[PDB]
Symmetry: C2
Subunit: 249 residues, 2 copies
């Protein structure tokens, strides 16, 4: 448990080492989704699985989320991207760190897709877990996570997601992002994981992205939901097999 500073916004994070406390291991940065945080069941499961195969984990609470600074309503993808650059720059100064990996769920899955492209030289492999990768396009077309609006007259505030508020700025920012450019720029190995009864983010976009990527493996979680209600073990298993593969090379 610590704080990484990002322009005065404290980002809360958890560095978990393998039990053996090795002097050298790789690091995976893990990013939760919209209204999420680093202690969610699926985040912890992935983190624990990694730790048992020798990968340190750095789970970071993004702007306005978890125990980080900022209000939820003020968060945007530019801020999240800025935070991720700050967490990478922090990881780069850790002595124990050999290679750096990225994983993340939903909005956090999208965010690591963006952020690995931007850090393409640095990030050895990428794990988007049910990435909300259509957020930008659907924003341009007038919806955000179930809520609709005129994409040319964005409201000042959107109220939804169980008592939360969100400034229209979120939408103004998301609309600018061309996700496909980021996908074309990251040619290193990608595992996308996705449940095919996902209610929140549609399975079929992940199929479309797995194919755009130069080197992407798509693992389907049969019958499963957005946060893997039914089969989280199938996700942890997927991540385990992929990463054993990657740390061997």
């Amino acid at each position: 448990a610590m704080y990484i500073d990002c322009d005065g916004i404290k980002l809360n994070a958890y560095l978990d080492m393998p039990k053996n406390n090795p002097e050298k291991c790789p690091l995976c940065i893990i990013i939760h989704g919209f209204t999420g945080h680093s202690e969610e069941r699926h985040i912890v499961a992935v983190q624990e699985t990694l730790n048992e195969i020798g990968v340190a984990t750095l789970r970071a609470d993004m702007y306005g989320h978890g125990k980080s600074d900022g209000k939820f309503e003020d968060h945007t993808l530019f801020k999240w991207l800025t935070n991720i650059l700050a967490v990478v720059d922090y990881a780069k100064k850790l002595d124990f760190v050999t290679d750096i990996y990225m994983a993340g769920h939903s909005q956090g899955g999208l965010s690591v897709m963006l952020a690995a492209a931007m850090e393409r030289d640095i990030i050895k492999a990428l794990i988007p877990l049910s990435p909300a990768a259509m957020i930008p396009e659907i924003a341009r077309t007038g919806e955000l996570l179930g809520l609709k609006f005129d994409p040319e007259n964005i409201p000042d505030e959107l109220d939804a997601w169980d008592g939360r508020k969100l400034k229209g700025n979120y939408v103004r920012v998301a609309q600018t992002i061309r996700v496909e450019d980021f996908v074309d720029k990251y040619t290193k190995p990608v595992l996308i994981v996705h449940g095919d009864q996902d209610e929140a983010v549609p399975y079929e976009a992940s199929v479309a992205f797995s194919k755009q990527y130069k080197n992407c493996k798509l693992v389907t979680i049969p019958g499963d939901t957005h946060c893997y209600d039914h089969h989280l073990e199938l996700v942890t298993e997927a991540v385990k097999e992929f990463m054993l593969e990657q740390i061997a090379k």
Copy 2:
């Protein structure tokens, strides 16, 4: 007045100057300086005073790592600047006297207003990029920023900038992502581009191309002039004047 606008704990220094008049209700132009610049530079002040003279309030703002605002120069990126601009807009929209909101900006601030205006396209009435540095994302993509050559695929941790300044490589990683042409396409209200045709820092011809891409843009060339209009600043202000009186008359 002078004031600080909070942007997530980063204080942004700004100047609100009224048309004096008052008046009771009037338009407001946001004015954004360029890379290593600030709100008290000659060319910025001059444009500011001209607007004030024809009835438009001005809100000049220092961006992250610049002028009197918080943060280090080497830590600024275009995403920080844009985020800063949306906080300035959010502040402006709360001012009771404000009728219409315009944007203007010089060089990197010219680029920033091209981007921000598209993002705020329902709010911003007209747009004035002054010698906009709108090639920055393209030359970041090619590894040719600041008289340097670097691999755009293996960006250095730190680049040397103007006059002993440093610039982190994050600046580049962020700039490579921005497709200026998308933002140009999305802003279909009146634009006035101004550019001097002996511009040392930012090639004139790029502004020709952008001016044709925009649905409604007038380009005013300043023949013989430099990046900061060392010779014919008069012409810039006169250009801004006539465009704006015309926009006020609509």
